[PDB]
Amino acid sequence: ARVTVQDAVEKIGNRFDLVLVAARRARQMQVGGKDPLVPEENDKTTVIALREIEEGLINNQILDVRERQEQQEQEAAEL
Amino acid sequence: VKSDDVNGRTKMYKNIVDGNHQMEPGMPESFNVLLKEIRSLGINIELED
Amino acid sequence: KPLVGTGMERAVAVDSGVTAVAKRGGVVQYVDASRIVIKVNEDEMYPGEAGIDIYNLTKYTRSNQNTCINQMPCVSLGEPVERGDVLADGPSTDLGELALGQNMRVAFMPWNGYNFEDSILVSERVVQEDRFTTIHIQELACVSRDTKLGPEEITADIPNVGEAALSKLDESGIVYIGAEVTGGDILVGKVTPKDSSLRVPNGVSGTVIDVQVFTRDGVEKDKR
Amino acid sequence: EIKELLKLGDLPTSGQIRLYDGRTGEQFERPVTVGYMYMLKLNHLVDDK
Amino acid sequence: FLKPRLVDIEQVSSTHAKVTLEPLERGFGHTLGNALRRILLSSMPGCAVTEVEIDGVLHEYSTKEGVQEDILEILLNLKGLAVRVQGKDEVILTLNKSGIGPVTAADITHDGDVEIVKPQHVICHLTDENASISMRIKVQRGRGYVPASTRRPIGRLLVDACYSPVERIAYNVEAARVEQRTDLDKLVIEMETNGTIDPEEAIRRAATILAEQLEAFVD
Amino acid sequence: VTEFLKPRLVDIEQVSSTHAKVTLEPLERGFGHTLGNALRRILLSSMPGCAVTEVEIDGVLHEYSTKEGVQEDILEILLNLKGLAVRVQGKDEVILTLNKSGIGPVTAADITHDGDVEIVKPQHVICHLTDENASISMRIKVQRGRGYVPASTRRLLVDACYSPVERIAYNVEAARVEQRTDLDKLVIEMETNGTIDPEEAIRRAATILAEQLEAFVD
Amino acid sequence: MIKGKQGRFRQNLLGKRVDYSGRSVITVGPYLRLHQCGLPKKMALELFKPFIYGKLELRGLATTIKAAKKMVEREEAVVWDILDEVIREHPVLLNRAPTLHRLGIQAFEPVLIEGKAIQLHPLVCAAYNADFDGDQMAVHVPLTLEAQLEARALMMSTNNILSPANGEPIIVPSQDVVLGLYYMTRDCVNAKGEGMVLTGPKEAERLYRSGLASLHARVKVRITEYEKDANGELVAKTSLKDTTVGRAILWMIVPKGLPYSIVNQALGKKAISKMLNTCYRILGLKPTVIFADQIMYTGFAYAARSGASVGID
RNA sequence: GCAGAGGUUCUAGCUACACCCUCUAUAAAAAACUAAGGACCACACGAG
Ligand SMILES: NCc1c[nH]c2nc(N)[nH]c(=O)c12
Numbered sequence A: 001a002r003v004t005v006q007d008a009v010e011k012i013g014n015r016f017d018l019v020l021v022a023a024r025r026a027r028q029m030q031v032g033g034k035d036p037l038v039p040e041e042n043d044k045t046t047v048i049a050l051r052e053i054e055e056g057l058i059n060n061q062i063l064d065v066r067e068r069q070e071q072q073e074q075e076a077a078e079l
Numbered sequence B: 001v002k003s004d005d006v007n008g009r010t011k012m013y014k015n016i017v018d019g020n021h022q023m024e025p026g027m028p029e030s031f032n033v034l035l036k037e038i039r040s041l042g043i044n045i046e047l048e049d
Numbered sequence C: 001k002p003l004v005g006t007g008m009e010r011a012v013a014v015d016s017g018v019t020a021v022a023k024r025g026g027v028v029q030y031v032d033a034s035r036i037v038i039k040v041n042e043d044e045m046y047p048g049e050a051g052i053d054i055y056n057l058t059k060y061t062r063s064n065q066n067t068c069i070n071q072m073p074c075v076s077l078g079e080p081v082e083r084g085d086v087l088a089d090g091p092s093t094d095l096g097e098l099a100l101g102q103n104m105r106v107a108f109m110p111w112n113g114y115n116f117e118d119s120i121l122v123s124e125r126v127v128q129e130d131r132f133t134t135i136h137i138q139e140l141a142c143v144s145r146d147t148k149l150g151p152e153e154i155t156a157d158i159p160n161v162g163e164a165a166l167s168k169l170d171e172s173g174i175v176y177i178g179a180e181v182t183g184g185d186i187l188v189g190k191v192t193p194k195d196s197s198l199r200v201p202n203g204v205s206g207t208v209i210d211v212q213v214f215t216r217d218g219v220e221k222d223k224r
Numbered sequence D: 001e002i003k004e005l006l007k008l009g010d011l012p013t014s015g016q017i018r019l020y021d022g023r024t025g026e027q028f029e030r031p032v033t034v035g036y037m038y039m040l041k042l043n044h045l046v047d048d049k
Numbered sequence E: 001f002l003k004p005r006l007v008d009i010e011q012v013s014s015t016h017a018k019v020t021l022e023p024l025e026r027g028f029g030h031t032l033g034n035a036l037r038r039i040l041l042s043s044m045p046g047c048a049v050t051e052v053e054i055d056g057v058l059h060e061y062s063t064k065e066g067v068q069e070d071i072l073e074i075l076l077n078l079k080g081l082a083v084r085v086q087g088k089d090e091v092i093l094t095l096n097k098s099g100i101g102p103v104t105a106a107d108i109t110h111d112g113d114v115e116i117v118k119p120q121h122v123i124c125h126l127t128d129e130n131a132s133i134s135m136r137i138k139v140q141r142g143r144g145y146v147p148a149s150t151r152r153p154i155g156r157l158l159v160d161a162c163y164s165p166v167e168r169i170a171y172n173v174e175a176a177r178v179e180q181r182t183d184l185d186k187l188v189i190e191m192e193t194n195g196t197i198d199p200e201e202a203i204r205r206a207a208t209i210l211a212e213q214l215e216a217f218v219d
Numbered sequence F: 001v002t003e004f005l006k007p008r009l010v011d012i013e014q015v016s017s018t019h020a021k022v023t024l025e026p027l028e029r030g031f032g033h034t035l036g037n038a039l040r041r042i043l044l045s046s047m048p049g050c051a052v053t054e055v056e057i058d059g060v061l062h063e064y065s066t067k068e069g070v071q072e073d074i075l076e077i078l079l080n081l082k083g084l085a086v087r088v089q090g091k092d093e094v095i096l097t098l099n100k101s102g103i104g105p106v107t108a109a110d111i112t113h114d115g116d117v118e119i120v121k122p123q124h125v126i127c128h129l130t131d132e133n134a135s136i137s138m139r140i141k142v143q144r145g146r147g148y149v150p151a152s153t154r155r156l157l158v159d160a161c162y163s164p165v166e167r168i169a170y171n172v173e174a175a176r177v178e179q180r181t182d183l184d185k186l187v188i189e190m191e192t193n194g195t196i197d198p199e200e201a202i203r204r205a206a207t208i209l210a211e212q213l214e215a216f217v218d
Numbered sequence G: 001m002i003k004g005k006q007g008r009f010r011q012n013l014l015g016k017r018v019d020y021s022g023r024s025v026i027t028v029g030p031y032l033r034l035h036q037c038g039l040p041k042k043m044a045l046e047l048f049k050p051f052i053y054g055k056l057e058l059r060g061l062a063t064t065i066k067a068a069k070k071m072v073e074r075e076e077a078v079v080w081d082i083l084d085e086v087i088r089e090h091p092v093l094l095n096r097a098p099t100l101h102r103l104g105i106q107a108f109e110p111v112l113i114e115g116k117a118i119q120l121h122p123l124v125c126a127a128y129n130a131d132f133d134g135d136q137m138a139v140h141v142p143l144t145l146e147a148q149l150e151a152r153a154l155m156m157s158t159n160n161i162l163s164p165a166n167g168e169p170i171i172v173p174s175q176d177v178v179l180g181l182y183y184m185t186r187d188c189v190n191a192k193g194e195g196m197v198l199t200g201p202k203e204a205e206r207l208y209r210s211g212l213a214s215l216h217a218r219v220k221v222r223i224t225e226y227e228k229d230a231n232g233e234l235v236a237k238t239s240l241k242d243t244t245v246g247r248a249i250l251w252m253i254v255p256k257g258l259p260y261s262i263v264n265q266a267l268g269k270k271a272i273s274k275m276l277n278t279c280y281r282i283l284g285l286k287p288t289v290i291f292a293d294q295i296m297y298t299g300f301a302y303a304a305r306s307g308a309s310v311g312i313d
Numbered sequence H: 001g002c003a004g005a006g007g008u009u010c011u012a013g014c015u016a017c018a019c020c021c022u023c024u025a026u027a028a029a030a031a032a033c034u035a036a037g038g039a040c041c042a043c044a045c046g047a048g
């Protein structure tokens, strides 16, 4: 669990961009079937995104690249 | 969603029990009441598109 | 009683109506928890038709703020009673002396922040002595209107309910006088002409003390 | 007259006595005030909130 | 080291006594003097009435003819009754009185085990010459204060039970008078009981509780 | 009616070889204080420990004085000694002599062995030497006492810290057992000079208390 | 029915009443950290009903919504275990009635308690301007995932330390903790344990708990004063500083970066607020929340031992 | 309600946003799916 989010907002400077970039990660963990890269431990799906952002594993570019790769993979199956 | 959206409340009450916490804004019924209370005053107020 | 009072406590209880001041002087002939019978003296009584005086004490009755209004005897058999003297302590009144609260041993000090800026720490000894557990008499009412398609029924045959809820109900559809109902329990059975039975509001957990039934002339009075 | 009444019994004239902490069991320095106060219970109970 | 022993028990009255623990080394006398008080005030086996069923009255808030006290007052008087039972954890007490005159705890019929320690405790006053009262009292053991709410027929009343034989525990540390030692402190504990529990066995139980609790973090 | 909730500790968060955090979940209601405060009072001021008690500098006799070659005054030298943690065997008293000369800190490792005396912190600095020609020498007195016997209540006099414990702090927070209401959750944080681990410290402090109550155990 | 405080524009369009709400009276709530607040079980059960239904459906306990409603109304043992799941990391908004400025409505992490009153961390009872003479706060709930993340990245009580009107801190210790600290940081010219030399605060706390030395006594101690003078590095200097036992005990609570010229004075209220401000300035936010949470514990604990009572004399 | 019809239940239950099942003339074998009508005005009360 995280109480102070100051570590995260250094990675995403706006701290308004932080919420919008963490909501997508939380949605991809609740609706989408993807698994968290951080070792999950009892935590809900809304602080796992902040934990990932703190580690520097997620930002506004990495998730866009991942979704582009998903689009390409879907294009591969289209043949 | 919380206060007044006939297609928002009945949607999110099903979304929450389903497992996903999404939102759909709709548009408050109080605004559709104010539109009528001004339209019935001889003043035509509408919405563009 | 207040351990430290102004001196206007023996003049607010008497002058109000809560107490029952004796209007004639004499001796107590028969006391009881609900009535006090005083035998008047010879001089204070009229030569004819004097007899003796009887006071009826009002037992637990709902007040306008849902607090109990009770009278307790303050005398005993054989005790002489003088004119204009209190002999029935009212609600929040001891020995004919106004007494609203209960004196408590108080110490002024900060205690680990549990009395931070206006909080009041209270010992378990207060609850154990039951020095602050007040009564709260609350009144409920069920109405049988005469709607279209037919009037509603007061019977105890409630469709689509189990056998557990009807245990606390008699044959006529009325809760037994003395049951211990809780939140969500059924009090009186009213089925709308096609389940509208009155239910205790959530959280309330009390005991029924009395039930009074009003009936309109023309319709038949039921068994209860 | 309050001081004379206090001296009529045994309690200290100043009106403060040495309390003792409950948990630790040690002594409280700067002895504190003790006595009896009339305390009403207002009817704004929490069960109605 | 030195070992405290139960050297002297003296009773000033029928309620409270003054136990003594003579040899104690400096500092202990103020550690045991608080441990044995916190344990004593919070967990002791006592007996108190729990269920009272009167013959004719349905619920608590109903007056009974011929009795000066309200039924609520009778229940509150009964809650303070001080009785002790020997062998059975549960017992039923029957009270039967008639005629004008106050009723007392001594009027209760006594079985082989259940005996009342204060036969002057007034329960209710009978005023009418032809009034009568018969009640069944259920008395059981317990520990601590158990409210009635947290614990079937309409004619059985519920009274909160407060199993706590001890009311007011006080202790002090006085320097001992050993003929060759120093800093040795003797401890005196005053225990204002309700008259049910004996002092020495009370101390023994309040120390066995500690001996069990401490065995958690020790070999 | 004699059934009592006996605790089962969940973890022992041992930070280092001298710091620990012992905890007990259900414990008993109002028993957390009765155990924690009793343990604190028994072990904070009564333990069979051993430490220094008195020093005599061969050159200085008066307490408010200073020597040459040392940047630490004897006000500071004697302050560096009472913290020196030393354990001995059954012998109740032995005299330690320190003899070293040379620029550089005089660590605890330079203390003469004098037999079976054991030191747990060899790197413990005593007095830094700044002059090559300077030579420090003193005698250290140790005893097997209890508690903490200050010198104010008693040739240099230095407060003796026999009890190995250095800091004690207990806490109590609500720990409900599932449906059952929360009672006491004792947590104890021990800090020890280093002779014995905190776990052994607690398991020896509880023995003394549970052994005191031996004539009242039914 | 358009204009005025009764018209739509100011009654039904701007201030819409909301679902998932609640109300209760205030309580001291001292134990909970300043990032969490109390909540009665009988209220958190009703607030989080759809979440409970969803979790019961996931567990398979309830086949349909009807059975879930029945078991929720049963209030049996399983329901509480489910409730202790949907409450784990779900912030709630404790909103005061007349919210004049921005800090009026803050977020908190729930901690389920019995009773029937909403607890509140004492240090935030100043921004709310909330007394304890029976005041009433309303509890709201964020539903969507974005709302949960917002009430964590903007509204948590650990996020707004400095008020927007001025840079000065808004969580300044208010009534009892400040008095306790003031009584801790003082000096009596003659109390037992005067003129002695102490190894360090670890030993001062023991020398005071034993009763061998009074709380106020001018003594000589050694302290490891850490310095951030090297850019990004902590320089450790230790000098035998002269102070009181009470001040020395207070040293361990403060973080290492701060110097020793702050806990040496009489420590009134403005001194405490300035100490918090300097800690925030030179140490950040994460090592200031912990410091401000620890200072209240020390202040309460040493204002309880003081027995600071008022008498006629 | 595959379209028509009937439906266990856990008020009522092809629309309220609804949803599913079996069956072929008409009801009866089965589990998974939802949350309802409440205006105005006086008096008193509490807090900021
Ligand atoms: N009410 C009859 C019935 C039983 N099961 C049902 N399931 C659905 N989806 N709808 C219904 O109407 C029924």
Ligand SMILES: [Mg+2]
Binding pocket: G130, G131, G132, G133, G134, G135, H047
């Ligand atoms: Mg207020």
